[PDB]
Amino acid sequence: IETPITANFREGLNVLQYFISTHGARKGLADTALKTANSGYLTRRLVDVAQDLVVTEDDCGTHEGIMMTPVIEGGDVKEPLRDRVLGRVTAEDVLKPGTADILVPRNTLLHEQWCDLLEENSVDAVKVRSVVSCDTDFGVCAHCYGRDLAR
């Protein structure tokens, strides 16, 4: 709109100002109305994909999967490599930019002590055993998942 407001509540509105606030708020309500619809709709699909999945195994015994890399693009960090992996597993025998400083038998949990210990060094990309890597026949191995958050 061209011409703005010139007052507040305590000053006391005039007709048009409230008149014009109306359609804005009404649009907000109309948008509020029916996010619910599509939400539950797609959500029901989301589940119905995943009726089956379940854990069956502890360790797939399979190959490493992905490399994790932080999200520092455009500005500074928005999800550190430190923070995201917290609770994942380790792909592989890795170590520090201080070289030959290993920390794993190819597989370790990543509690925050380790995120600290590794935020020491300037490690800035690290691999993981994920589910895509996991080769369980109608199941998933535990280690390729991570941590139970609620627990």
Binding site: L13, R26, A33
Partner: protein, 1340 residues
């Protein structure tokens, strides 16, 4: 001024001179029904147009004929209340006088053959109150005006749905009031297509061929012709100069012996300017220029008579030569500048495979009748039905005029059916705007939409009944006899009545209205929708329609509409809303004249104002001259601006001219968000008027008018003086100026006692006046359930402070004090209904008697002998009302019950009980009974008790009516007897009646004797007539079903007051559950010991911008700063002049508010009663946007000797401390709503089940079970739980063995399970195997 005014005055704070008092509110419902039913000679509205449309009516083929003449209403059988009580509709009969006439078509037109004059009943008509509502089956109901898409003609432009193109899709459409639709449109690939009634795509020219047009005439009218002139060697042309406008040349585009534009070069606007002025239009050129152009029309060498050329054929140069050998020196051609002119139509012709009217019509016929062979007569018959037959197509002239306007036509009227010119001009406009000229239109603009009020609906159903009848009458007229077949012989009225009664009671427009509060009524009838027929659907509908358009302003308030799906669908009306004769809206506006604001007005529609300019009333006017400052916030054209002073033509009217009424009442709305104001105004409708009418101090003024015009309450129709009073009713006498002499002219007003609402709530009126008093017209005399001295009130006002408290006001919860409940001041009551019934059966009837076995005798104790409880008694759940009994059949038994009844030997009769009883949990008081019985069956003992009761009751009411009437009417017999002779000292002692026979004199007293003779004959006339009339009005039985014998009713009642779990709130969105009461000792108290009433949570005020309300709280307190003070002067008991001064000084507080007053006028007594009213408070009326300012409230608290803060120093009571800082405190006004814990609570442990599937039902009335969807289960498997939902599916819903077993087992303290398989599963198995399926199961 008025009397009830003087009884109490509310204060003003508004400084805008109003020019227009509000109108009557609900004129529209009344007006629509009136113009539906009542008479029209010529400008037909309502019935008469329906008839004259569908009449006269011939025979099957002519020989007989029917002639409408005129109608005849019937006054009804009964009154309102009798229909109310019998469960009966209020309605008026209908007759019509018809005239059957045969004329000898055997003879030339041998009319004088036979006539039958006769008038005939068909159908009765439900009717409107004086309020505006209807009634049916003893049920009060209202329908709703609708809003929808007008007739006429609309355009639109879709946004490239072959978005490969990203191209416009112009299309145009007409809509009639009845008949068939038509759609014209452009394809993306530059060709017209057309379709009736969403049929398949067809071209546009196809119709023109179908309409006996020529390609000749087609291109005659559509195109602007490019013409040539060849004289024996080579080409000349003629260049209407602006045809290469902005184009690029092709050759040396050159004048006579001169060039203007060379090859490949822009033809400037100035080169064509030269061509224009320099006056050449005969341009020799290269003939090769022709290659690309098209023939106008077939110009051949007719010597052969053979086609050298057919129209719509792009030219050549060989053929140029061939028609050169014809000798033809020009052949006209087509124009194509892709910028300005569109040959899309020529292109379409080139696609058209068709030539003649005949096969064109064949294909039309085919499309609308697929699979059908070609048949000429049916083709032209179909076409002529669809678009030029008055039978099956109607615009209903608003479409006609509107159409005419949309074409910029000088005329306004026509037919409800087409011409041809219409079609031409519309396609011309469509192509012109496809070139880009003109504009598309907007649908939401209110100048393109129309209401649909009641009379229109009712016309529709009535005439379609007429048509359901005339089908048969065509089937019957020319068939049989034509001298004995009376007109009546052929008419069944039951189609008519069927249609109309189905509408008034089963359309989704009629609803059971809202007996909560007056405003509930007045708004629920001032609703608008676009649902239902001729309407929309929320899933079909989107967002543009929901939202706002700048033309609503002054017509529809954007604030009052619910929060579910149906948001912008309904849009309740504005205040000064008038509608238009055609169905359009309009709103008043003030005239400007040379800067002067004149007082006269005009009502203006959704359209003209945008062409005009309009200012606002916020504008502080310069005292009768001009307006003060140059810049003024005005608007036109859809939006706003700032304008100078002479510049303006009109101005708004008031500072409320948009709002709805719920958007009117609350003050300082300006100081609040919109969304919460909406919410609260929708909270302002679910309320109850509690036991009392505790007035809100602070308002706007509208309370009285809404109160009046609700029609719930009483009012004067003629001034006068009271003569008698009672709690049940009043009696008045009229002054003699208002008196008409011959009539008895002495009124009365019975009243309405405790009376079930449609929402199961009390209703009651009450007087609020006195005796020996004067009255003028329109002066109220009694109040409704939510009123006090003719001014609305729903809730009550009371003390709140703002702070947390120990968590009991965590999130917008509430905490309160126990004085308020012992005061019972929000206590309410609820009439409730029950009933039983006596019927026939195959064995025999249900009958009605006390004497019933297997009863606790004390239960019987509450009954009469008939089997019926008394009046005024107490009732508890499971108690019995009625001893009804039923002829039993037989009972097969088991050896163990057999064993018990072998031991003791008791029996059952061949009858059992059908005792009506109290539902569970209810307890209450009985205050009335009503019984109905057939006309012919014996009225039994208690039936007769109440029958002879109501006999006596109405007869006493009427002997009182009589007695007062005849008593006042003895006015003759003293002035007449004491003169015409005089013996007064001798007369007065004697018996009154033996005075005809005293000293009798010359003929004056003979005329006296015959006069009194006829009059005391009229005496016993009146007696007989009226008593006996209503006597057999009453004693007659009832109109009801087969099987039935008689019924029972009970109108009991129950007392509800406040407990936790209840909702309540105020006028600003401030919702809240109540969480706990408390004693007063734990509540606060000021230094002066006054405790507090309620406490709330203050955090959420900026959370949701309900800021304005706080202001009032200051003001709230301020009222009693006067009120309590005055109460001092009461008990102090000082003197007149003190408070007189004091109070005119109070009303003169503010600066320049308009209400003046002179209390020197009044008596002492007027003043003292005024003060005796005000003793508790002083109420205020600040309008919404001519509101007040805190300057005045602070001034007024200085007057009331209080802080400018209204914020003061408080203590605790549970431990007596002081707090750490002040607190804002005053009185605010709030109220309850209809969402109540026991109206909302339910549980269940075992019971009602289905049979299709055998798992329980839902509904508290039917012992509801709770639901457990499909996402709860998702959650439970999330936790990893199987046993739980295993139980929730096996036993608590479906599996039978399990549920029974486990019941039996937990009663043995066993918490164990034994599953099986469900039932709905096997159900599904059967329902598949029905479909031819070998579904089955594998053994393990």
């Amino acid at each position: 001024y008025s009397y009830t005014e003087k009884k109490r005055i509310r204060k003003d704070f508004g400084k805008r001179p109003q020019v227009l008092d509000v109108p009557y509110l609900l004129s529209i419902q009344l007006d629509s029904f009136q113009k539906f039913i009542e008479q029209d000679p010529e400008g037909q509205y309502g019935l008469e147009a329906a008839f004259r449309s569908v009449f006269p009516i011939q025979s099957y083929s002519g020989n007989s004929e029917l002639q409408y003449v005129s109608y005849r209403l019937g006054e009804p059988v009964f009154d309102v209340q009798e229909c109310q009580i019998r469960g009966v509709t209020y309605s008026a009969p209908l007759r019509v006088k018809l005239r059957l006439v045969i004329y000898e078509r055997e003879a030339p037109e041998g009319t004088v053959k036979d006539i039958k004059e006769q008038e005939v009943y068909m159908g009765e008509i439900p009717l409107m109150t004086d309020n505006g509502t209807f009634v049916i089956n003893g049920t009060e109901r209202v329908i709703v005006s609708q809003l929808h898409r007008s007739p006429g003609v609309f355009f639109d432009s879709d946004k490239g749905k072959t978005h490969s193109s990203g191209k416009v899709l112009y299309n145009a459409r007409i809509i009639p009031y009845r008949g068939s639709w038509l759609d014209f449109e452009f394809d993306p690939k530059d060709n017209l297509f057309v379709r009736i009634d969403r049929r398949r795509k067809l071209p546009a020219t196809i119709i023109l061929r179908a309409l006996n047009y020529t390609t000749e005439q087609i291109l005659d009218l559509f195109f602007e012709k490019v013409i040539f002139e060849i004289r024996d060697n080579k080409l000349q042309m003629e260049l209407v100069p602006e045809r290469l406008r902005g184009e690029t040349a092709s050759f040396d585009i050159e004048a006579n012996g001169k060039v203007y534009v060379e090859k490949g070069r822009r033809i400037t606007a100035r080169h064509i300017r030269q061509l224009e002025k320099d006056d050449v239009k005969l341009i020799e050129v290269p003939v090769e220029y022709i290659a690309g152009k098209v023939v106008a029309k077939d110009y051949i060498d007719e010597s052969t008579g053979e086609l050298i050329c057919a129209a719509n054929m792009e030219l050549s140069l060989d053929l140029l030569a061939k028609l050169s050998q014809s000798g033809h020196k020009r052949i006209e051609t087509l124009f194509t500048n892709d910028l300005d002119h569109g040959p899309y139509i020529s292109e379409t012709l080139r696609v058209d495979p068709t030539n003649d009217r005949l096969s064109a019509l064949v294909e039309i016929y085919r499309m609308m009748r697929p699979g059908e062979p070609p048949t000429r007569e049916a083709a032209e018959s179909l076409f002529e039905n669809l678009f030029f037959s008055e039978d099956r197509y109607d615009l209903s002239a608003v479409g006609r005029m509107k159409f005419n306007r949309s074409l910029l036509r000088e005329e306004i009227e026509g037919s409800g059916i087409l011409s041809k010119d219409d079609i031409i001009d519309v396609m011309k406009k469509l192509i012109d705007i496809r070139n880009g000229k003109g504009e598309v239109d907007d649908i939401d603009h209110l100048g393109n939409r129309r209401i649909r009020s009641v009379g229109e609906m009712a016309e529709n159903q009535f005439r379609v009944g007429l048509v359901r009848v005339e089908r048969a009458v065509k089937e019957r007229l020319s068939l049989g006899d034509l001298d004995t077949l009376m007109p009546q012989d052929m008419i069944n009225a039951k189609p008519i009545s069927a249609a109309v009664k189905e509408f008034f009671g089963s359309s989704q427009l009629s609803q059971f209205m809202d007996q909560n509060n007056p405003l509930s009524e007045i708004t629920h009838k001032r609703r608008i929708s676009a649902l239902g027929p001729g309407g929309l659907t929320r899933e079909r509908a989107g967002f543009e329609v929901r939202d706002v358009h700048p033309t609503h302003y002054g017509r529809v308030c954007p604030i009052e509409t619910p929060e579910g799906p149906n948001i912008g669908l309904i849009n309740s009306l504005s205040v000064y809303a008038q509608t238009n004769e055609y169905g359009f809206l309009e709103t008043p506006y003030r005239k400007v004249t040379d800067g002067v604001v004149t007082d006269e007005i005009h009502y203006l529609s959704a359209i003209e104002e945008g062409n005009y300019v309009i200012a606002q009333a916020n504008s502080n006017l310069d005292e009768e001259g001009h307006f003060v400052e140059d810049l003024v916030t005005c608007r036109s054209k859809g939006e706003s601006s700032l304008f100078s002073r002479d510049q303006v033509d009109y101005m708004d009217v008031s500072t409320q001219q948009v709002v709805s009424v719920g958007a009117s009442l609350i003050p300082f709305l300006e100081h609040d968000d919109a969304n919460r104001a909406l919410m609260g105004a929708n909270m302002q409708r679910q309320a109850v008027p509690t036991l009392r009418a505790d007035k809100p101090l602070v308002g706007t003024g509208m309370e009285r008018a809404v109160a009046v015009d609700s029609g719930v309450t009483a009012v004067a129709k003629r001034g006068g003086v009271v003569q008698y009073v009672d709690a049940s009713r009043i009696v008045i006498k009229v002054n003699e100026d208002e008196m008409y002499p011959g009539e008895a002219g002495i009124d009365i007003y019975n009243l309405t006692k405790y009376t079930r609402s449609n929402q199961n709530t009390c209703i009651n009126q009450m007087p609020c006046v006195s005796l020996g008093e004067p009255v003028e017209r329109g002066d109220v005399l009694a109040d409704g359930p939510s009123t006090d001295l003719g001014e609305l009130a729903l809730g009550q006002n009371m003390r709140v402070a703002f702070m947390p408290w120990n968590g009991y006001n965590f999130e917008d919860s509430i905490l309160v004090s126990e004085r308020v409940v012992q005061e019972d001041r929000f206590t309410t009551i609820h009439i409730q209904e029950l009933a039983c019934v006596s019927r026939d059966t195959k064995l025999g009837p249900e009958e009605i008697t006390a004497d019933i076995p297997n009863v606790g005798e004390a239960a019987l104790s509450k009954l009469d002998e008939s089997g019926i409880v008394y009046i005024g008694a107490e009732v508890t759940g499971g108690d019995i009302l009625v001893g009804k009994v039923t002829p039993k059949g037989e009972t097969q038994l088991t050896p163990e019950e057999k064993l018990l009844r072998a031991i003791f030997g008791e029996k059952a009769s061949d009858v059992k009980d059908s005792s009506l009883r109290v539902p569970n949990g209810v307890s209450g008081t009985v205050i009335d009974v009503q019984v109905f019985t057939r006309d012919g069956v014996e009225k039994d003992k208690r039936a007769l008790e109440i029958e002879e009761m109501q006999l006596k009751q109405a007869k006493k009411d009427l002997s009182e009516e009589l007695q007062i009437l005849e008593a006042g009417l003895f006015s003759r017999i003293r002035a007449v007897l004491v003169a015409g002779g005089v013996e007064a000292e001798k007369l007065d002692k004697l018996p009154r009646d033996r005075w005809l026979e005293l000293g009798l004199t010359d003929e004056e007293k003979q005329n006296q004797l015959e006069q009194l003779a006829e009059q005391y004959d009229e005496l016993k006339h009146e007696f007989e007539k009226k008593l006996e009339a209503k006597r057999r009005k009453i004693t007659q039985g009832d109109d009801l079903a087969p099987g039935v014998l008689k019924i029972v009713k009970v109108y009991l009642a129950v007392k509800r007051r406040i407990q936790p779990g209840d909702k309540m709130a105020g006028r600003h969105g401030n919702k809240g559950v109540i969480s706990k009461i408390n004693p007063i000792e734990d509540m606060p108290y000021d230094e002066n010991g006054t405790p507090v009433d309620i406490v709330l949570n203050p955090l959420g005020v900026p959370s949701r911008m309900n800021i304005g309300q706080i202001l009032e709280t200051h003001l709230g307190m301020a009222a009693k700063g006067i009120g309590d003070k005055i109460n001092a002067m009461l008990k102090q008991q000082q003197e007149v002049a003190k408070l007189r001064e004091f109070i005119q000084r109070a009303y003169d507080l503010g600066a320049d508010v308009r209400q003046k007053v002179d209390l020197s006028t009044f008596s002492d007594e007027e003043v003292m009663r005024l003060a005796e009213n005000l003793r508790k408070g002083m109420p205020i009326a600040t309008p919404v946007f001519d509101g007040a300012k805190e300057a005045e409230i602070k001034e007024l608290l200085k007057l009331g000797d209080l802080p400018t803060s209204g914020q003061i120093r408080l203590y605790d009571g549970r431990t007596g401390e002081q707090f750490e800082r002040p607190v804002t405190v005053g009185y605010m006004y709030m109220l309850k709503l209809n969402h109540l814990v026991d109206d909302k609570m339910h549980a269940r442990s075992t019971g009602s089940y289905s049979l299709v599937t055998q798992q329980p039902l839902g509904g508290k009335a039917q012992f509801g079970g709770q639901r457990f969807g499909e996402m709860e289960v998702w959650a439970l498997e999330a936790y990893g739980a199987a046993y739980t939902l295993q139980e929730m599916l096996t036993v608590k819903s479906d599996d039978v063995n399990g549920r029974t077993k486990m019941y039996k087992n937990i009663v043995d303290g066993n918490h164990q399970m034994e599953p099986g398989m469900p039932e709905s599963f096997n159900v599904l198995l059967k329902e598949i195997r029905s479909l031819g399926i070998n579904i089955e199961l594998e053994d393990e």
